[PDB]
Every structure is written in structure tokens, then in C-alpha cells.
Amino acid sequence: SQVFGVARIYASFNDTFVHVTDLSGKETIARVTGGMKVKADRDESSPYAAMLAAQDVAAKCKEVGITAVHVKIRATGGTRTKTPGPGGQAALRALARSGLRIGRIEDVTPVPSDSTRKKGGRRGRRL
Amino acid sequence: GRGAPLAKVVFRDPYKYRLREEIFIANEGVHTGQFIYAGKKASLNVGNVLPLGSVPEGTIVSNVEEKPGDRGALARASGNYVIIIGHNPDENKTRVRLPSGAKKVISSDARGVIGVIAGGGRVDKPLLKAGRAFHKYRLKRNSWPKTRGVAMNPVDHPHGGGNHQHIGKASTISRGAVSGQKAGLIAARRTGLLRGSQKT
Amino acid sequence: AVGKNKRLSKGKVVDPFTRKEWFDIKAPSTFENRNVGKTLVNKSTGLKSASDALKGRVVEVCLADLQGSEDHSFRKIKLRVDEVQGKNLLTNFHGMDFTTDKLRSMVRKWQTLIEANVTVKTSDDYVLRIFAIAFTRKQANQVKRHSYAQSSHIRAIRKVISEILTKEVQGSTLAQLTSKLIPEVINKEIENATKDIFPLQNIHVRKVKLLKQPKFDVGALMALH
Amino acid sequence: AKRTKKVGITGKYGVRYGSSLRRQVKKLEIQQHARYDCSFCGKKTVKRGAAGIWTCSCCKKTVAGGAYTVSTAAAATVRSTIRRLREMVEA
Amino acid sequence: SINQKLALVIKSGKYTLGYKSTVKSLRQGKSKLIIIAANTPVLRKSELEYYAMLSKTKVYYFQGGNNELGTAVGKLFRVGVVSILEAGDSDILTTL
Amino acid sequence: PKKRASNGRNKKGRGHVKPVRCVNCSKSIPKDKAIKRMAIRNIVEAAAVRDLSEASVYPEYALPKTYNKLHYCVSCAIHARIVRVRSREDRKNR
Amino acid sequence: GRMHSAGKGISSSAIPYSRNAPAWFKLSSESVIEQIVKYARKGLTPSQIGVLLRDAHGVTQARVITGNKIMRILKSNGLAPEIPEDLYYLIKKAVSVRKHLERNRKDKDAKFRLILIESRIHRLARYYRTVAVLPPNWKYESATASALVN
Amino acid sequence: MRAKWRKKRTRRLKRKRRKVRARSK
RNA sequence: GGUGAAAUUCUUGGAUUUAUUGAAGACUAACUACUGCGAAAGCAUUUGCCAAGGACGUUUUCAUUAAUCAAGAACGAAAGUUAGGGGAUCGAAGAUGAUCAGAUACCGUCGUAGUCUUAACCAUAAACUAUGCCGACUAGGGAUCGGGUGGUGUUUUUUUAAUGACCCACUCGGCACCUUACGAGAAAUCAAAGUCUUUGGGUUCUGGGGGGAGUAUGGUCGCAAGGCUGAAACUUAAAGGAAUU
């Protein structure tokens, strides 16, 4: 009744990524991200770049013929941030409100069980 | 001439009533009186000659053969071993870890000796006096004592000559050079102290 | 940041969706509402074909679609394709995982967590590892606000579930175990086998991830489809 | 009588061949010359022949090992890993 | 454990130690249980088991060596084969 | 002079605890020394639930919730204004 | 207390006031002394003689029936061990720790807990030598400690 | 001015003077 | 790829990423607590082997064998050393890019020793509860760990026999909290820092103004870096601790 895809949102610092994907996961559709929509290099993580990137992905999603996708918003993960980027929910709302049905929201960010060590030294980053 | 010891093991000739003498380099834990098993159906015990095509992952096997009917090609030194890091069922081959630290594939029908060769850690005590080095090198070949090419006459060595003790030209020698000037480092990728990892 | 590229290429247009075809996904009869969906794959050419790249493929779909009921929301099958049957492909149960969001809600402070694992082979030569979750309960009339176990009863229960999970797996093939973990009949019997040793609540299995598989045995696949 | 307090075995080398050098030599030789026991009889009389050769006088069953130790740590872990590998294989 | 039972039969009951004593006691068949160490040669265990089967006497192995057995029997020397002919206050014949 | 009865942070009868890393400045802070704040905010932003609902498969009923723990150093804690210097009378409040 | 620790856990016993107890015991003094010497010939140490006698028969402390404590009569009938019961208990424990040391050589705690038992068996031997129980020229030998346990 | 800097200067002084003594004795 | 903003650097050989794995090394996250063991350092996957330790209970034994420790012995964070294994992240040195009048620092990228392990040394710290150990007494309240006792207590099957989880009441050993001050303290505060001028339960160690200086020298352990003991000359009338505007 309705074809299904994958959204695979990667929201992190300095960039946010939305990757339309097939259920297998190997197929790649609309690999645009929230970095090409702003010529300032500081607004990439802002909602403004996230909304514009989602519109471009939605237009590409309409061209191929995908009516719905499954979303799993993820962060950098590992031992870097472990928190979603500021542009995550902004991109999620923008792409969902362009005629694409969303379902089964999930968090797929990679979390370690205290693996390796984090950069910064014992006193950490001291700005 | 060989730091590792060789075990003299007798086999029974299956085609004619004679007893043969085979020389096998001794591994760890091999003792006189122990029954050794050689073949494709023997169990996984130290010293056996099981082929690489019927062994599990990660087995410590020495005396690895490059090709069938070679009778000893890899891991013939004291304290060395070859690790198994995968077999291919189809077009049967085996990726192995030779002591040098490189990747190579060989036929699964290559026989190997399970275990590590005796005499491990042989080079762990200095030679101290010149007598030990002389007695060690007198039974192998004639390459001792050696003379430095820098302190040599210019006619007898390219590195020699001059009122001082210096090489003069570049010590590194290209692989494209012909025999006659291959003195020093031949096709050296880089020189100096090996500060860092082996990048294996 | 389109105005930042300097060295675009070091060596010195038509999209590939026109060469893609809609392939419907099929699921075994263990789940009544198979109806997984469709995917994308390149055109079957002589160089690589489609069945070659489609033979190894894993698709994750939640049980709310395969089983239909809303109570199966927190479970998802990572279905793996293993055959092509003329624009329809057959799948087998390979990966099992429990929803990542519900883990963080499942784990709570002021209580002790359990952890058990095994390595057990089925009747049809499918070795598997089972991980089970379990949390202590704040029983009625209890006033102590920590619900902590002695941790020596822990050694008993993890032994119990390890022995029980091994026994339940013994005697059943891949078809039988797929029809029992969805109804969660096992979790009912963990409470039955652990009621008299420690009250317990929230019996769930995180992953039933598959490791090794037997020979192809294509005829078994048609039995499930 | 404790004739030499620290040089140990390396008293034949006199005052030559360094200090740290003579110390590694000392450690290697007191591993080398120690009296060992047969794993088949238990009598502490196993001696050393040539390199990698451990020959006893009572059990009369020479077992090849390391040049300075009957079975080095690497030999021990190798034996353990083949033990466990074959145990898994025949399990 | 096993060691305390052997100690008890040593102090209470009669005991025979070594090769000649145990083969003799097997020959007259006055023994009841024999103890053989694992470190001994296999031919030792095989012939001891054959003699025990001929004399229908039970056989018990121990997962240890010769010096271990000497320590276990409570004696400062070493023993390889231990045979008992009368328990007395112990009950090793009942169990094991 | 001494400021708190529990001197650093409730390190009593233990002697040592495994240090952890901060999530902002990556400072090596002890487990009990680092303040942990729950992050139970929903996967969707504030409000706007009906906007996804109109384009939601199934009759919604998803309501996913993200949970995370934040490890903060003392310097980052004051900078983030989550914990602020309290009066001497206030300081004995948990 | 807690000689080799820092605890203060109290677990002791409290005897009844009546030195002639419990006024219902009916077996004769000749009968009870038979039971102790019967258990003594089995080889049980006086510590185990007390618990079995107390928890099975109608006698809790043999002092109130017999003329002395259960150890004292053991001297009279000549069934006493060659060493005090205490010294045997730790020396068999000491050799057990030493047997542990021989196999694995990395447990620093086993070496440290080994120090505790040495701090005991010379102190008890010194008191025993002072009160003239052990021979006046008796010393403890690590190698001969295995021979002590018999 | 901090304590480890006092200690580092003093240790440097001991090393230089130890070199001086070794050169003399 | 980054920062408040930049730059170095990698990208038609496809950087970044998606999907499948393989190899390597490190750690045991969420549960994880004014919560547990160990003398301390320290100890935060599964299972097996070995032994040891605290607490509980005893109408079991010994009998004062008991408290402290000169000299003397064992363990001892991280860093460092020797010989190997190992060598993925991070990363004293260094190479670098910014910023600054200057930056060989804070900010970014590589990167050696090191961070992991084996055998042997190094014997140090904000190694702090900045509070020595042993023994008795002293205002109260609740919660929490282990153990035990009793209450047809409530549950947990084949309601019921027992178990297991709890409830109630009590007790011992604990990590300890909350309110007060007869008491102490110069106060910050303390159920010990109280039972010290109404001065005495027993015992070990440390200091006599601040600098010089934990330095000189002499011994002593150590392959060395370094550790232990440890001054004097000379100089100053102020340094130091607690609260207040």
C-alpha cells in the first residue's frame, strides 16, 4: 500500500547528515547533508542548514518514488559526543513535513562500554 | 651448524619389510619413546605432521611446506612458529602468519609440524669472548672475522680510501645497480633508528 | 560551504536509479503477516548480476509489521536474504536485537542488574548465544527503597537461566524456536522456574544473534516458504 | 662461606666484559646450570647436553626443550592453546 | 578429601609400599585397594590393572605424581604405588 | 580551611575510585566526583508532536524517549550554570 | 581484639551460673568418662570431642560431672597427642599456604597472609616453651613443617 | 613561585656539582 | 576535519558516509549508590581451580599465650630503568598551523619514549579522614551492608509443606549520616578534635620563630634517575592559623 525506505539521520556537531536508504542498507539515495546549504561554515549545525538539506533530500526522495522512510537519528557516537547535534530534530521535522510519512523512530548512535580512551589529556580541553 | 636439535624418528615402510631413518627437527615436549603420528587423520598433538587443510583456526604449527612434496620450507629455526589465520574451503588455500610478520597464502595440502621448535630463545645471552663467536661460526661457513669497508683500501672496496674514515658517496645502493658496488644498504626504503611501529 | 574546495580531483551525470528494480521481500511462515516490503538493487547484468549482490543481504524490520500486534513493538528481526525466486526473495532469521531506546528505559537506578550468556547449538546445527535481561522488583508492602539482591542469589539465577535456556534450545530446530520466542512463552517459565528463589520482573532477551550456519540446504528454505 | 656477594656464577670472567653484560650472563647461566626433574619420574637430576637438549641420568628419556629452560613460557602457552583447540575440535 | 582417608588408613590399618611388596600382596591376593600415580609409566598401570583383574581387586588412580604420593601417605620419602590390605578404622572400601 | 564534611565528594571508607572523562572538556574526573544529570528529553523537540503525527505511520503510539547521563567537570558545571555557589546556610542542602 | 585484623566482632559463649547443672542429668560419672575415652580412641581432637558430646548427649561441659576439663583427663589415660591441639591447627594451615606458594608465585596476598600465621606459631611456641609443654630447645622449621602434620 | 620549581633547580644543581666532583674525583 | 572565529591536513586514485566482514591492541560503560572488600596502594565482564579474610552463632578447646612498637622485614598509585613480547587510541620530546609587539604555552594535525604484558629494579605523592594504635564511658533519630532471633505477619507453587523476597521488633559487627552541645576548641567545628588546670588508662613517632634548607658534608640502598640520615655559617621582627568591613 505504501513503499518504505530508511532515513538514517546522522546529527552531530559542525554537520548533520540525512541518508535516504533502502531496507537492505546498501542502496544509497540522496546523500546530501547540512553543509552545502550554507556558505559560512558556522551555520552547518544550525537548524537553517538542517531544514534546507531536508528539503533537498525530500525532493530527491520524491523523484525516485519513495513515499515513506524509517528514521534512526544518530550522533557522532563512540567517545566523542554521545549526544545528538542541534540540527537533528530540525532536520527531522523539515523532511517529515514535505509529504513523506515517518514511522518507528529509533536511536542508533554508537555507545561504547568504556572502550579505548578520549583525546584531550588528563586535564582535558582547556580553552 | 643448527641451534635447533633434530629428532631421529623411525617409520615403518608399508610396502616392503624395511625400517627407514627420518630426521625431524625437535619441537617442544618431544621425548624419546613418544609415539609420533604423521598423516591426515591423526589428532591435534604437538609434533604431529597434520596437513594445513584439516586444522582449526589459530593453531601453532611449525615446519610449514610451501607446496606439496617439498619436505620442509617454512619455520625451520629454533623458536619460530607459523600461525593459521583462515582457510578457504573452495580453491583450498590457507592464510598463514610467518615469523617475519607478513601475509601469504599456501595450498591446504601442505604438511606442517604442530608445536614450536626446540631451542627457543637461543639468542638471549651474549657471546662474550671471541672464542664463542669463532666456535659458532667455524661450523657454518667462512665469513668471520669481517673487515669494515670504510677502513679499507680504495681498490679493495668502494667505501675505502681517503686520509679519514668516511664513506664519501651515498651508502644506499639502488636495486638497479649491477654487482660490484652493492656495498652498504641495498634498495633501502628508509634509514636511521626504527622509531615507531613496524607497520605490519 | 560550497566555496571552499581547492583541489577537487587529483587524477586530473546520469543517475543510477533508472537501472534499479523493485524487489519484494518475503518472510517465513513463522510470522503470519510476512509483507516486509521492497528494496532497491541494480539491474541484473552479465558482469555482476542481481542475485550475486542480493544473496548476502540483511534487513531489519520491527515485529509490529511482521506480527501485526502492537505488543511486539520492542522487538525487531534482522532478516537475512539467502535466495532469489524470480522477483521474490526468501529470507531466514539471522539477527535478533532489542530496541535501543527501550534499553535506557529498562535500566533504572536503585536496583541491581543481571547479565548472563551461553553458547548452545540447536537440533538442526545452528549454534546460538542467548542473552537475558532481568531486574529486581519493588514488591507490595515493601518499604526499603533499593530492591537490592544479595548477589549470591545472583550466582544461582544466572546459573538457572543458563541451564534453562540451554535445555529449551535443545530439542528444537530453527523453525520451532522462532515460533516460541515471539509469544514469549519462555519468559513465562523463567518466572515459573525462579518464583521460589527470587521474585523478579521484566524477563526479556536482548539478542539471539546467529554466528554459524550449516550447509545451504535449499530444500529447507522452501519448507518455510 | 659466601666468597662473592653479588657476581654469582660470573667469577670466571674476572673484571672484564662489563657489569650489565655479566649480569645478563649470570642470569642466563643460573637458569642453564640448575638441576631439573623428569616429568616422568620426578627425580631432580635432569641435566643439559647440547643446545636445546635436556638429558637426565635416571629416567633416561631425553626431552627436547629450550636452550636454557626445559619449557619456556611461550612453550607453556603454546601447549595450553593446542590443548584447548583440540578440546574444542573434539567437543 | 582423598588424602585424609589415606592418612587414616596409614595410621590405623596395615600398608604396603613399593614395587615388590605390592606385586607380592597381589600374588597372594591379600590386597583390597591399590593406589597408582599418574606420573608412572603406562606399562606400570597396565600390568597393575591386569594383576588386579586376575585377583578381582579394585583399582584407583590419582591425578598426581610420585613425590606427591609420598607426601600424601604422610611419609618424608616418595612412593609410586600404594596397596592396602586391611583398612581398620577407615571406609575406603565402602566408598570410592 | 575545610569546606565540606564530605571533603571532596562522599569519598569515605573507600580511598580510591575509578576516574571518568567529562563530556564537554574531557577532564579526568572521579566517578562520584563528576555530577550526573539525567537527560530524559524526548527524541522529538519541544511540542511539535502533532506535526510528525500527521505524517506518522500507524496510529502513532510510538512516543520514543531518549535517556542519557551527562558527566560534567567542576569548571564546566559553573560555566553551564547548572550548579551555582550557594550560601553557607544553603550549602547544607542536598 | 582481632589479633591480625582491625575488627571488633564479638562471638563468644556464656556458661550458666549453676556449677552443678542441669539437675536432670542421670548418667553416672563413670559412664560419661567412658564416652570421652571412647571418642578419644577414634582420634578426634578435644575440640571435636566437645561439640559431638555437647550436641548429642545430655552433657554440655564435662567439668561439672568429671573432676576436670576434658583435656586434663586425657593426660591421665595417656591418649594425648604429642603436640598441643592449637599448634597442630595452624601448622596444617601454614603448610597449606606454603603448598599454595609453590604452585603459583604471583599472589602477593598469599605471601602477606603467610606472614600472619608465622606471627602466630612462634608466639604460641614461645608461650608453650615458657610453660614447659614443648621441649625447651624446640624450633619451627619451614622444611620440616610438612613432617609436623604427619 | 612554585615548589616543584625550587626542587627542580636544586636537583639541577646537584647534577652539575656531581659532574664537577666526578671530573675532580 | 576542526575552532569563538581560522589554519595545517585528507579529497576523480572518491575524502566523509552507507552495507558486509576480517585483523590489531586498550577497557569492562548504562546498572554504578554520602553503596560494597582489602592493611594500604587498590579492586567495577562469563565460567572453572586454589587458598586466604571479616562478620554471625555456639552451654566446643587452650589458657593470659595480651597493647604498642628501636633496630630489622613484606606490600606499596603514577612516573622512570634493563632485557623481551606487544605496539590499535591517547600521548613528556619534536615537527608543525594559527593568535599575540613577542608564544618553543593555552587552541588544531601528525608524531618518538610511554600508556598493555612478561622476569628484575625504582620504596616516592594532597600515599588526607591533612585527625597513630589498643581499652572503658558519655544526648538522641532515621536510613543503609552483612548475620542472627521471634512474630499462623504479607507474599512466592502442587492456596498449603520449607525455601526466596519482603514487613514488624530486637541484637552484633560495619561505611556512615541528621538535630543539639552537658564537653572541648582560637574558631572553621567535633559523639570525637569529649571524659586536659577538677591537669595521670597504656604505648610508638614528630616540632620549638620564619628563611637558609630538606641544603652542605659524611655514611648507606640503588645500573642510574634517585631514596634514608642529616647540619652549620649567615639573615630577619616579623612569617603563619582562624573570622570581619
Coordinates of C-alpha atoms (C1' of nucleotides) in Angstrom, one line a residue, chain C residues 4-12 78 107-113 115 117 139-146 148-150 153 158-159 195-199, chain I residues 1-2 6-7 10-14 19-21 30-34 45-48 143-147 153-157 162-168:
Chain C
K4 CA 35.9 26.1 0.0
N5 CA 37.1 23.4 -2.5
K6 CA 40.6 23.9 -3.9
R7 CA 41.8 20.6 -5.2
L8 CA 38.7 18.9 -6.5
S9 CA 40.5 16.0 -8.1
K10 CA 44.0 14.5 -8.1
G11 CA 43.9 12.3 -11.1
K12 CA 43.3 15.3 -13.4
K78 CA 17.2 -8.6 11.2
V107 CA 17.7 0.1 33.1
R108 CA 16.9 2.0 36.3
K109 CA 19.0 3.1 39.2
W110 CA 18.4 1.9 42.8
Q111 CA 18.5 -1.8 41.9
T112 CA 20.9 -4.5 40.7
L113 CA 21.3 -5.6 37.1
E115 CA 23.8 -10.5 33.0
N117 CA 25.2 -15.6 28.3
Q139 CA 7.1 -5.8 45.9
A140 CA 3.9 -4.8 47.6
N141 CA 4.2 -3.6 51.3
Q142 CA 8.0 -3.3 50.8
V143 CA 9.3 0.0 52.3
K144 CA 13.0 -0.4 51.6
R145 CA 13.7 1.8 48.5
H146 CA 16.6 0.0 46.9
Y148 CA 18.9 -4.9 46.1
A149 CA 19.8 -8.6 45.8
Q150 CA 22.4 -10.3 47.9
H153 CA 21.3 -15.4 44.8
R158 CA 22.3 -16.8 36.2
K159 CA 23.1 -20.5 36.6
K195 CA 9.4 -17.8 41.5
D196 CA 10.5 -19.6 44.7
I197 CA 14.2 -18.3 44.6
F198 CA 13.7 -14.6 43.9
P199 CA 10.5 -12.6 42.8
Chain I
rG1 C1' 38.4 17.8 9.5
rG2 C1' 38.1 21.2 13.0
rA6 C1' 40.7 30.4 11.4
rA7 C1' 44.6 27.4 9.6
rC10 C1' 42.9 14.3 3.6
rU11 C1' 39.6 14.6 -1.3
rU12 C1' 38.0 11.7 -9.9
rG13 C1' 43.3 7.4 -7.1
rG14 C1' 36.3 9.1 -4.3
rA19 C1' 26.0 -2.2 3.8
rU20 C1' 29.0 -7.0 4.7
rU21 C1' 33.1 -8.7 7.2
rA30 C1' 24.5 2.2 31.1
rC31 C1' 23.4 -1.0 36.4
rU32 C1' 27.2 2.4 39.5
rA33 C1' 24.7 4.5 45.2
rC34 C1' 27.4 10.1 51.3
rU45 C1' 32.5 -8.8 32.0
rU46 C1' 31.1 -15.0 31.9
rU47 C1' 32.8 -19.6 34.0
rG48 C1' 36.2 -23.0 36.4
rA143 C1' 18.0 5.3 56.7
rU144 C1' 21.7 1.6 54.7
rC145 C1' 25.6 -3.5 54.1
rG146 C1' 26.4 -8.5 56.2
rG147 C1' 24.4 -12.1 60.0
rG153 C1' 2.9 -11.3 59.6
rU154 C1' 2.2 -10.4 53.8
rU155 C1' 3.5 -12.9 49.5
rU156 C1' 6.0 -16.9 46.2
rU157 C1' 3.8 -23.1 43.9
rA162 C1' 10.2 -25.5 53.6
rU163 C1' 12.8 -22.4 50.6
rG164 C1' 13.2 -16.9 48.2
rA165 C1' 11.6 -11.7 48.6
rC166 C1' 10.0 -8.5 52.0
rC167 C1' 7.0 -6.2 56.8
rC168 C1' 7.3 -5.6 62.1

